[PDB]
Amino acid sequence: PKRKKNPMQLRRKVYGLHFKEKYLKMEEWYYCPLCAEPKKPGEWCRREDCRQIKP
């Protein structure tokens, strides 16, 4: 760095899509019909119902 960056340069990084995708992003989920925990589709739990039929 050759100079102190003002609040605008600090604020410029949040307009970027990289920032938004990394930090402020909401996850999509449903309720596991076997466990009733919030769940992302494609990720399962160690429980013998959830291994064979993985809901």
Binding site: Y31, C32, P33, L34, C35, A36, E37, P38, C45, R46, D49
Partner: protein
């Protein structure tokens, strides 16, 4: 050299031959000293640098000085404890006075009105509850004070309880006294079970099922009448069905059934017990037994509108390894939102519980998978434990 302050907190680069400082490992900062040095304060006894002189006077005055009380005093203190009869009278009185002045909820149109908070009501009730010995829902209380009908029941049942406790003795205190050194439920206790059932009934309308089930436990604690016992056990059957406590429902479902000979012909209770027992059996996926139970209900009780409903609903519905796997009702979804394993925390990979202490997943006393400490244990210089050549 020295692009920052000459303090031993200051930001930038320093040098040893110019700004000599000794080795301060975690030096508590300029303001507040934070949770890290305090972690050290509560575990090893002082701050990690050993320059900060441990000074705990301010908590010695808080814990040890306060509990000092000498024997000559504390041998006399329990001779002065308040009269519980009088305390029940006073608690009932001011609790009722505080509930009576709760404003009627104004009904708006097009939007729901925010109910007035029960702030002033927590203070009388918390005295009343543990003068009585039963914990009461705040939520159920507010929901009862919403409905005019429920408020009516609650109010006049409180009034009856008041009057019976003033004119008569306190029956649970009677049968507590006669226990350590049998009779039908007394007037005041009838009032009490009635108002507790009212408040649990209100507790259900707001959708707190666990709490409504927990309130009625003390409600059966206070009932010695088999009619009262039947009704209360039934009620707990249903309140534990909504809570998805299925062993609780399929416990309390059948006592309400067992009371059928000595309960009056004018009761709906035992049939409700049948319904709960059956429903609990149904929710655990055993349908055959469910239909068997409803068959028994319609055998003994002939036609019964709930057992009509449940016979035809079961009929409409018409492997052991997969049973009670399914999540059928929302309250266990709610209970699954809390107390669940999420990504990164509250799973089996973060901290594991062992004898009420926390561990890293590396020392996991129930697990030897890879990375676990117990894989590194060796044979401890006695006998070869495993035939493994290289590792262990």
């Amino acid at each position: 050299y020295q692009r920052g302050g000459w303090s031993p907190g200051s930001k930038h680069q320093k040098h040893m031959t110019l700004n000599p400082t000794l080795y301060l490992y975690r030096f508590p900062g300029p303001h507040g000293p934070g949770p890290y040095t305090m972690k050290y304060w509560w575990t090893l006894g002082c701050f990690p640098t050993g320059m900060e002189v441990p000074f705990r006077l301010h908590e010695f005055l808080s814990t040890y000085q306060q509990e000092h009380v000498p024997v000559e005093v504390e041998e006399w203190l329990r001779c002065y404890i308040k009269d519980p009869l009088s305390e029940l009278v006073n608690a009932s009185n001011d609790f009722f006075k505080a509930v009576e002045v709760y404003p009627e909820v104004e009904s708006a149109r097009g939007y729901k009105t925010l109910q007035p908070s029960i702030a002033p009501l927590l203070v009388p009730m918390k005295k009343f509850e543990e003068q009585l010995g039963v914990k009461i829902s705040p939520v159920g209380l507010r929901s009862v004070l919403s409905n005019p009908v429920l408020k009516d029941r609650f109010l006049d049942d409180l009034f009856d309880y008041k009057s019976y406790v003033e004119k008569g003795g306190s029956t649970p205190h009677r049968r507590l006294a006669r226990s350590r050194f049998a009779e039908t439920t007394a007037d005041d206790e009838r009032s009490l079970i009635l108002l507790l059932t009212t408040i649990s009934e209100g507790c259900i309308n707001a959708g707190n099922y666990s709490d409504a089930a927990s309130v009625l436990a003390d409600a059966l604690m206070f009932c010695h009448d088999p009619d009262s016992q039947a009704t209360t056990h039934a009620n707990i059957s249903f309140a534990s069905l909504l809570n998805a406590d299925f062993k609780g429902a399929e416990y309390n479902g059948r006592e309400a059934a067992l009371l059928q000979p000595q309960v009056k012909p004018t009761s709906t209770a035992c049939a409700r017990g049948y319904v709960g027992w059956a429903a609990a059996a149904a929710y655990q996926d055993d349908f055959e037994k469910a239909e068997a139970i409803v068959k028994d209900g319609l055998t003994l009780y002939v036609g019964n509108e709930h057992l009509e409903k449940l016979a035809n609903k079961l009929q409409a519905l018409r492997p052991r390894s997969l049973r009670e796997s399914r999540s059928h009702l929302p309250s266990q979804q709610s209970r699954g939102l809390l107390s669940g394993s999420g990504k990164g925390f509250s799973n089996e990979f973060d901290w594991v519980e062992f004898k009420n202490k926390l561990y890293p997943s590396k020392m996991d006393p129930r697990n030897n998978e890879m990375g676990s400490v117990f894989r590194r244990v060796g044979d401890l210089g006695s006998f070869i434990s495993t035939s493994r050549s290289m590792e262990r």
